[PDB]
């Protein structure tokens, strides 16, 4: 029992993390078989990419894998990342894909200065596509990821903050989450919302750990819900979604329309000073997996 | 910038991490140079444990270090751990110590089943000596630390689930962190406390991530401030927390008493439907030193 926001152990993940140079600018890479991937506004000198990668050496980029120098042999642009072939491939590569997330969807992020992690959280794509994250200056080329028994599923890379102080970035093959850009321009977040379905699965958390004093005798229609729903700035809730939920109704005996109600309930009169594990918001950065993961007891490696 | 739970990176300590099984009981050990701890009550069949270990031989002890097998060569007792030696040094035995810590200090879970790692989380021990944890059964061993540079640091061994649904453990000596004895018992979490000081380090990190609307023109004396935190069950604030919060104070402008009476009119008033870093509580479980590190960029390996 008990209820945390749990991140994946990093240790797959530390073993890929490298400190790429060039000119006076310093970032992060990631370091898999023989190539290195990082941000590509490392290379040097609004912007026109190409023209700046084609005057430039293998020779300008410093690569450090701990202490070891690694030898660019050549080097090449993907969307918004760089692609550096370096003449060794990492023994401690694990398996992995590079796999691309739905707003909604959560993954773990593994903060990093000069190719050393500092520390790991986890969080969720939001849905205007930026991430509320925890960074400072140098932790461009950080990875978010997921892992699924002993595979290492890379779905970002961290680009940028916007003035909002939230964060945006792409998945591993270059192509940015949201309508962003890596240049300068007055790019902000569109308005977000909040993500209906993780909030049901939290609080079918709450139920299997003990809370239940928002339950009610209540029911309701997926379309009654969803004009109050939209009320109060959060998503839809599809057909899918109250499938997707059917194992944790299943678990608990608490009919996801049921739920909805409760739901409904909260929003129209707050929480009148009692909380939901921990906490006196609703939590909406929880998925149904995330919530069987951590009540059932699912491991990896 | 941006503000999360943040842990530390967990790889050092994955490496470390293998089952136990003896008789019918099955639990997470840590492996370190050519040693095995895990808890005690894995020695079979109210208890008298040097009774029981009297009773058994080397070979009734089964230490899986992923596939391969691991040969106990030795075994004895340190309060409520168990020490297993083994014919093999871990190879991958990071520079460690063996650490107690303070109610009101945080953290790293390595949450564990059967010796695979399943998540990483961040928490605080609280004053009365119970961690609110989320473990399933067979989580049994798994360990907590912080990392210093290149250190771990190990100060936490998980043993039970209170009734409340919080946790209780050792540190890695075999010493219980409170009241608490490996046998069945109607022990009970005593009553909590709010860690003050920690209350005030988290309102630093919303100032210095341009939440201020909690702020306030009055001051106050230590002394009133601690008659008022009593009276909402929070910690006394000490002339050595004042000091600590110091380096805080500079960065922000905000003198440490300034901000002590935001508090008193934060207790006083509620927040009046606004919220603090994402959160509609006053959080306590972050120390100064965990927001000087997530707000100045302090990294490890």
Redo the contacts between chains.
Sequence with gaps: ????????????V??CMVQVTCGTTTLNGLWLDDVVYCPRHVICTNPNYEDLLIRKSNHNFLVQAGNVQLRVIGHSMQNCVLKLKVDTANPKTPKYKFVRIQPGQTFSV?????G??????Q?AMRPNFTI???????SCGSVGFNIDYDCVSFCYMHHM?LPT???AGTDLEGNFYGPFVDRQTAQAAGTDTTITVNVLAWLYAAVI??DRWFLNRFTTTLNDFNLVAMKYNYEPLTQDHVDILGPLSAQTGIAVLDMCASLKELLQNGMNGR?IL????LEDEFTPFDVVR????????
Tied chains: 1, 2.
């Design positions: 029992s008990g209820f945390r926001k749990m991140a994946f152990p990093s240790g797959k530390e073993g593994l903060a990093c200065y000069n050393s992690p500092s520390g790991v959280y969080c509320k994250g925890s960074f400072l200056n140098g903050e102080g939230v964060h750990n003990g909380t921990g906490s006196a918001l951590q009540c059932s007891g699912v491991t990896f490696q």
